Paper text:
The PvuRts1I crystals diffracted to 2.9 Å resolution and phases were obtained by the single-wavelength anomalous dispersion (SAD) method. However, part of the putative active site (amino-acid residues 71–76) was not visible in the electron-density map and could not be modelled, and may be highly flexible in the absence of the DNA substrate. A search of the protein-structure database using DALI revealed that the overall structure of the N-terminal domain is similar to the very short patch repair (Vsr) endonuclease, with a root-mean-square deviation (r.m.s.d.) of 2.4 Å. Comparison with structures in the PDB using the DALI server revealed that the C-terminal DNA-binding domain of PvuRts1I is related to 5-mC/5-hmC binding modules, including the SRA domains of Arabidopsis SUVH5 (Z-score = 4.9; r.m.s.d. = 3.1 Å) and human UHRF1 (Z-score = 4.4; r.m.s.d. = 3.1 Å) and the SRA-like domain of another modification-dependent restriction endonuclease MspJI (Z-score = 4.2; r.m.s.d. = 3.2 Å). As for other 5-mC/5-hmC binding modules, the overall shape of the SRA-like domain of PvuRts1I resembles a saddle, with a concave surface at the open side of the β-barrel. Similarly, we speculate that PvuRts1I recognizes 5-hmC using this surface. The interaction interface between the two molecules is formed by helices α1 and α2 of each subunit, and involves hydrophobic interactions and hydrogen bonds. The buried surface area of the interface is approximately 812 Å2, which is clearly adequate to stabilize the dimer in solution. The recognition sequence of PvuRts1I is approximately 22 bp long and 74 Å in length, which fits well with the distance between the two recognition sites in the dimeric PvuRts1I assembly. The binding pocket of PvuRts1I is shallower and wider than that in SUVH5 and UHRF1.
Author numbering:
A (entry chain C), B (entry chain C): 1 to 70, 77 to 177, 182 to 293
């Protein structure tokens, strides 16, 4: 789907909520910068472990900013396809969709579009800002540039071959063991794999994700596939879906078996690191 | 329906056509002037007697400007509710919805929004520009100010009492005879009425409007209501409908019986004047 195709669907998909459509459409158009990513109607986890999902109306991946304008339909469904993103150290600006006039409302938008304008001066003054690159939407490139990978809007991957490239894949269905070299290089101590899990009942696994974002539970339905956990860390790239029901893999963080809580039938993994360095064979 | 309610439905009703929604929404927002009327998806007759209806995407009543971006669904239906407007001496600017990039497309919008910007400098320099007045959307006020009334977006009226006020109604179902005073005052010579016709089969009349806009045909179904035309001019304010199926009365022009072509059963009226002065008992 083309960038414009993307841009044109983004602005036009918000016709349910009339107030939201205005304010979204105003700001994006107002701003008139095609070097700036924006996401619409992205469900979200916010600061503090709450298990509560919020709907962010505008999110700018490349600045840690989202706009909120104050739904159980979407929230329940996105969760259902793990279409969530953890937006921590993400600035929240807000706009009230009640008890206000347009002349004030698009004053706020006028103010907020300055933020977006000004919070990009910093990232350009500090040489951290990298112009929106749509065609590398779901690739490694960003991550190899940065050298690390956090939970966020950025760490999403179309295919397995795309996340494994951040961990030395040169050539990857199911799981991939990092070579002991890279494992140690990126600063994980042990025996380490990337896991591409389903986080629901699927074939022979009834898996699950805590509301927290912080505990994976996995339960084998078939028992000939009960096993002993030999891995010290799992880097988890969970199966999830688009608004258009396409498969993406979301980086959930680096997890590790909780051994007391775990069993042969039912293992429990806790989240240990919410980011991870990425491996380039350098210096 | 509130102005904002209007403004917010206007921008948000265009989600069928993705290219159109962008360009509409860009320009209106881009322009950011609440002292400017705009209409969306207004079907239209254009220069030269063609009987061909076009869809104008943006129309600014208070400047004779509409934007077109290049449908049989709407066209057929609007006609069906006489939701047409004759836009003559109306400037046409155009934008191609095919074989173009966004960076160019919103260049055009950037240019076109200058026109809208600059074609309002004239009407302010020449003291003719009167800031958008939504709550008098369908009233007489405009017309009493101007002193005359043309076919156009402006000459539309919620109730009969609203058009008859332009012709001396002080207090009006069916037809209203202008007093001989006003008839002569506004410069029509004869015996003159305002007609509020249905322009289709309705109860005891199978009426019709030529594709031209220029000939009303009326045929009595009941025959005890065949009559001799005694009126010299009919000022016609035709029954029509909103996008939301509310009744409005559109000024079609000043018409007169074509006597050769007419009959007892079936009278034919031709359009003689496409505007009309309006009566104030002055000087």
């Amino acid at each position: 789907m083309s960038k414009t195709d993307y841009i044109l669907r983004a602005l036009s998909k918000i016709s349910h909520k009339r107030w939201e459509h205005y304010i979204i459409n105003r700001v994006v158009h107002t701003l008139d910068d095609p070097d700036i990513e924006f996401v619409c109607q992205q469900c979200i986890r916010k600061e503090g472990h709450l298990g509560k999902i919020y709907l962010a109306d505008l999110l700018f991946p490349q600045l840690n900013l989202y706009l909120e304008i104050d739904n159980d339909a979407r929230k329940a469904d996105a969760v259902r396809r793990l279409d969530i993103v953890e937006a921590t150290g993400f600035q929240e600006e807000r706009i009230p969709a009640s008890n206000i006039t347009l002349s004030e409302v698009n004053k706020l938008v006028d103010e907020f579009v300055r933020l977006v304008k000004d919070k990009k001066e910093e990232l350009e003054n500090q040489g951290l800002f990298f112009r929106w690159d749509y065609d590398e939407r779901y690739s490694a490139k960003k991550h190899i540039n940065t050298g690390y990978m956090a939970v966020g809007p950025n760490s999403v991957f179309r295919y397995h071959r795309d996340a494994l490239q951040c961990f030395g894949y040169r050539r990857q269905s199911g799981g991939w063991a990092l070579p002991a070299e890279v494992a140690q290089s990126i600063g994980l101590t042990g025996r380490v794999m990337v896991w591409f899990p389903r986080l629901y009942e699927a074939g022979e696994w009834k898996n699950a994700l805590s509301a927290d974002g912080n505990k994976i539970t996995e339960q084998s339905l078939n028992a000939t596939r009960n096993y002993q956990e030999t891995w010290d860390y799992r880097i988890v790239m969970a199966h999830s879906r688009d608004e258009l029901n396409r498969t993406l893999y979301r980086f959930l963080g680096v997890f590790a078996i909780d051994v007391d809580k775990s069993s042969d039938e039912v293992k429990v993994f806790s989240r240990v690191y919410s980011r991870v360095n990425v491996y380039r064979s350098q210096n």
